[PDB]
């Protein structure tokens, strides 16, 4: 159990400050700080940017939440500062490599001492300044490498990224291996749960944790809609914040009643100098569609131009000759001619940070960006629009979420440069008057961690013999968040307890026992209206008219009647299909909050405070609680308003003609059943209701009252019951039951004994830190990589960097596809251990996770292929093909150092001289700013 608490100390006019204090520690305000600032800036520094440096002053860890365009490093550059005031080594990390390069590139032009540490390059690892991505983090803190016995500050930036269930999981480990003497800074993005990350922190190791929050924005911004088809931009929310409902409305009632365009929309915004302007198309294709659609408009001059081609000439001077003459730059050079240019993930590495820098010096003025390029890049534009709303993540097609918005929204203004930012928006289809005002109105994300378990983790802890998993996990971000739920559970649980103690007077038992029976009764009467509608006997029984009822445990909708019907199959059948079901196209009465829309879920019938309308919906043949007897005449061919009505007016009168009720049907006779046990139902339905009216409390009045009450009670002790099976899982065995199944394995395989330590076996698994390396220890071990070429050795190890399905699989060789069995086959008899062992996994996603598309390509290439010759034998983009093969490169370094573990030299130099035959003519080259 955590013990901390906040003080939340005040703040003038500002931003807002909490402070963590864990447990028993008294609040000592802050002092001001003495000395000289270690860093001068020249301008004018916020509230909050006081509060940072002050706090940084006194050498407390700390946590920011703001916009992006806040200019967060500008605190940075001070605490960096003073560590090289005081004479102390600096370490940085990034998430992605990608921003490393151009940070390593500021923090070495003005401050002039610092290093970088890549995967792929290591450049001065002698300095108070160590810039490095978090992973190698994790490997540096696995090995001794004793490099923190002198470094207390840490910095981390752009923390929010820990939303995914893959890859965000290793910060955890990263941070608690971490020594508590050292200190350190967080950047965040604007955060709702920001308070619970801060106490976790300030319980995890015992030190205070300053949190700072706020959401001033030097350049506010506007938000316009465009709906597909039409002109002007109706302005919904504003530099003041307004809502303005009646622009949404008129934007949605056009494109409802409307139920080149690109090219009309940037023709617009050029006249009126808002250059530069941002797209964001989530397909790739779609980005060169659109650029190749923009071939028909000129932006730059003639200086420019001659610019922009001795800048090429420059960059393109180290690409070598060969190199100069790919197809893409002589497709890109007169797209840029005219002032526009594309980035996405399919580009040249080269090409890439040409336009970035390009974009930054301010020549080129339309660039259309995909998803990953408004993370990253610190160089912001004058206004921002969006192709589409619906994107497909990777597992189905969905809408996009607030956080993304937002994110991608954030770009638009620049300080000083345009008074005002611009966001233009457009709607297609299914708009959905309900859905899509959230994404004006909802924060951005709530930060939840995953913590997903993996082999590596526990064999590297096994490796530490004074730390052992169980330890680490208590310590995980998981628990602690599913410990702030405790207390909240505890007083629900107490307050329905006195709540159900509270009203408690029946009188008497006899009321529980007509309860008991009358719900006997009400499953007697589902269990044969399971077998009424049936889609046998009730199939004869569907003519337009019958007025049936309907009631999917949610809500009762009326009487209708029915229009058409059908055995309309499962199109494209989710998980198979083996049941025909049927949909009957049946007349409800809707609300009209559900017709303006019409696209979210079909339902909300009207309610008795509204008129509502009447339209054919379509539902399940499961879901009719009721077949009546009755067909009301309906009219010819319809589709209006006023003979709908007559249909109501009809439903009217016919119901003031049996008041004691609709003679629904007979279920014995009327069908014709003749099947043997629905006789021992009716006998079991007509005993229940006989002895039931035989009871007296029936004819005793309240009886409505004291039934109402005890539902009421019921209802409160199915809560108490819920609650407390929740309750029973507080801290239960949680993700610790796999923990045992994943320990049980290694035993198993020969990685550990039953005595749980770690052996050499596991001691070269330890060393491996990128692919799944319990079946590469087995083809070390069982000797498959022997007997291998090195050419056909690599390519092997290339299925296990991809992970991307592609349309046509090539075919494959006997002497390269052999060892693909090779390695199928000793992948299953793994999978039947790991399913031995109560661990749900499914061995058909499992061979799909090493995907067999381009080892040839690996092969042809590490054969004295040219790069322009390579790319024309798969469906896949040029730069998708380069950066798969940087795990690869990287995988390949970690293995030469690997057959050194077990004496074995011979596969050793194999793997290395494989190494040096890859990095020959465009793959493998300095970035423009290395």
């Given at each position: 159990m955590p013990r901390v608490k906040v003080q939340s100390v005040e703040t003038v006019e500002g931003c807002t400050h909490e402070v963590a204090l864990p447990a028993e520690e008294d609040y000592l305000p802050l002092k001001p700080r003495v000395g000289k600032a270690a860093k001068e800036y020249p301008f004018i520094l916020d509230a909050f940017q006081r509060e940072a440096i002050q706090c940084v002053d006194n050498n407390q860890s700390v946590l920011v939440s703001a916009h992006t365009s806040a200019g967060k490093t500008v605190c940075a550059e001070y605490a960096i500062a003073l560590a090289l005031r005081e004479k102390q080594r600096v370490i940085f990390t990034s998430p992605i490599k990608a921003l490393s390069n151009q940070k390593y590139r500021e923090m070495y032009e003005e401050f002039q001492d610092v290093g970088l540490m890549t995967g792929d390059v290591t450049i001065n690892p002698t300095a108070s300044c160590l810039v490095m991505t978090t992973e190698i983090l994790r490997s540096m803190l696995y090995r001794g490498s004793e490099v923190m016995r002198e470094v207390a500050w840490v910095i981390f930036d752009?923390?929010?990224?820990?939303?995914?269930?893959?890859?965000?999981?290793?910060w955890e480990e990263t941070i608690i291996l971490l020594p508590d003497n050292v200190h350190y800074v967080f950047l965040s993005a604007t955060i709702p749960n920001a308070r619970q990350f801060a106490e976790w922190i300030c319980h995890l190791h015992k030190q205070p944790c300053h949190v700072i929050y706020t959401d001033y924005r030097p350049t506010p911004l506007q938000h316009y809609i465009f709906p597909a088809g039409g002109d002007g931009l109706h302005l919904v929310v504003d530099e003041n914040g307004d809502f303005r409902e009646d622009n949404f409305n008129t934007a949605m009632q056009v494109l409802r009643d409307a139920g080149s365009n690109v090219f009309k929309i940037v023709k617009m915004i050029m006249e009126r100098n808002f250059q530069p302007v941002i797209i964001f198309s989530f397909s790739k294709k779609d980005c060169e569609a659109y650029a190749l659609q923009m071939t028909k408009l000129d932006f730059n001059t003639d200086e420019e131009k001659k610019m922009v081609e001795e800048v090429f000439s420059n960059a393109i001077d180290c690409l070598s000759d060969e190199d100069k003459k790919l197809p893409q730059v002589e497709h890109v050079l007169p797209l840029l001619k005219r002032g526009i240019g594309i980035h996405h993930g399919g580009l040249l590495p080269i090409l890439k940070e040409t336009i970035e820098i390009l974009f930054s010096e301010g020549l080129i003025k339309a660039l259309f960006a995909t998803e990953t390029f408004a993370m990253g890049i610190n160089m912001p534009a004058r206004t921002v629009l969006f192709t589409n709303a619906r994107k497909f993540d990777g597992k189905d097609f969905r809408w996009i979420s607030s956080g993304e918005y937002i994110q991608m929204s954030g770009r638009a203004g620049r300080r000083g440069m345009d008074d005002r930012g611009i966001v233009i928006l457009m709607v297609d289809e299914k708009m959905s008057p309900t859905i899509g005002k959230q994404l004006l109105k909802g924060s951005a994300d709530p930060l939840n961690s995953a913590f997903h378990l993996t082999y590596n983790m526990v064999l590297n802890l096994l490796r530490v013999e004074e730390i052992n998993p169980e330890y680490m996990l208590e310590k995980s971000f998981y628990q602690f968040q599913h410990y702030r739920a405790i207390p909240g559970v505890v007083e629900k649980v107490k307050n329905s307890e006195e709540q159900y103690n509270k009203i408690v007077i029946p009188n008497e038992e006899s009321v529980v026992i007509y309860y008991k029976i009358r719900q006997q009764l009400a499953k007697l009467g589902k269990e044969i209206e399971e077998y009424i509608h049936k889609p046998k006997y009730c199939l004869p029984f569907l003519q337009p008219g019958r007025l049936v009822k309907v009631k999917n445990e949610g809500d009762d909708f009326g009487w209708g009647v029915v229009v058409n019907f059908s055995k309309k199959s499962n199109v494209k059948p989710n998980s198979g299909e083996l049941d025909p079901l049927y949909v009957v196209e049946v007349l409800l009465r809707c609300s009209k909050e559900s017709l303006k829309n019409s696209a979210t879920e079909a339902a909300k019938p009207a309610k008795p405070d509204e008129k509502g309308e009447m339209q054919v919906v379509p539902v399940l043949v499961h879901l009719l609680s009721a077949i009546s007897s009755v067909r009301l005449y309906i009219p010819k061919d319809l589709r209006p308003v006023d003979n709908r009505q007559s249909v109501l007016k009809s439903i009217q009168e016919v119901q003031k003609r049996f008041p004691d009720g609709i003679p629904l049907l007979d279920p014995i006779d009327d069908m014709g059943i003749q099947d043997q046990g629905l006789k021992k139902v009716i006998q079991k339905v007509e005993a229940f209701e006989h002895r039931m009216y035989s009871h007296p409390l029936h004819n005793d009045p309240n009886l409505e009252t004291v039934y109402t009450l005890c539902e009421k009670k019921a209802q409160i002790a199915i809560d108490i019951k819920s609650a407390k099976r929740e309750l029973k899982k507080a801290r239960t065995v949680l993700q610790m039951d796999e923990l045992k199944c994943r320990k049980r394995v290694l035993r198993r395989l020969g990685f550990a004994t039953s005595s749980d330590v770690i052996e050499m076996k596991g001691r070269v698994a330890c060393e491996i830190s990128s692919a799944d390396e319990l079946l590469l220890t087995e083809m070390m071990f069982n000797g498959l990589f022997n007997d291998l070429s090195a050419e056909q050795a690599t390519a092997l190890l290339s299925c296990f960097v991809f992970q991307e399905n592609s349309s046509e699989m090539p075919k494959l060789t006997e002497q390269l596809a052999g060892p693909l069995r090779q390695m199928q086959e000793c992948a299953k008899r793994i999978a039947k251990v790991s399913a031995e062992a109560k661990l749900e996994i499914d061995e058909e996603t499992y061979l799909s996770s090493f995907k067999p598309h381009l080892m040839d390509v690996v092969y042809t290439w590490a054969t004295g292929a040219t790069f322009a010759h390579i790319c024309k034998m798969t469906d896949v983009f040029e730069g998708s093909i380069i950066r798969c093969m940087r795990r690869l490169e990287e995988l390949l370094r970690q293995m030469c150092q690997a057959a050194k573990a077990i004496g074995n030299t011979e596969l050793e130099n194999k793997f290395a001289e494989g190494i040096t035959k890859i990095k020959r003519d465009i793959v493998f080259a300095a970035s423009l700013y290395l």
């Open positions: 752009e923390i929010h990224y820990m939303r995914d269930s893959e890859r965000g999981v290793v």
